[PDB]
């Protein structure tokens, strides 16, 4: 929180179901890419691979689990189903 630009919203971004990552279409002019996994450990400023851009982008931490069901990704550690 010491250098920002502007701030963005998880609802008002792309969704890239193949590797569960977000995007956004730098000002820049480039796709700022964001992982689901990454943000999960408290990620929100994030620099842009194209012109290193500081950005706060926030989340509400409801998609990043249930987008977990949506998408056919195979994540981490084994699956044990009980009830
Ligand atoms: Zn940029």
Request: aromatic residues 12%.
């Amino acid at each position: 929180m010491v250098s920002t630009y502007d701030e963005i919203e998880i609802e008002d971004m792309t969704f890239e179901p193949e590797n569960q990552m977000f995007t956004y279409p730098c000002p820049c002019g480039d796709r700022f890419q964001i992982y689901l996994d990454d943000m999960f450990e408290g990620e929100k400023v994030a620099v842009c691979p194209s012109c290193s851009l500081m950005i706060d982008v926030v989340f509400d931490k409801e998609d990043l689990a249930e987008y977990y069901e949506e998408a056919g990704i195979h994540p981490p550690e084994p699956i044990a189903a009980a009830a």
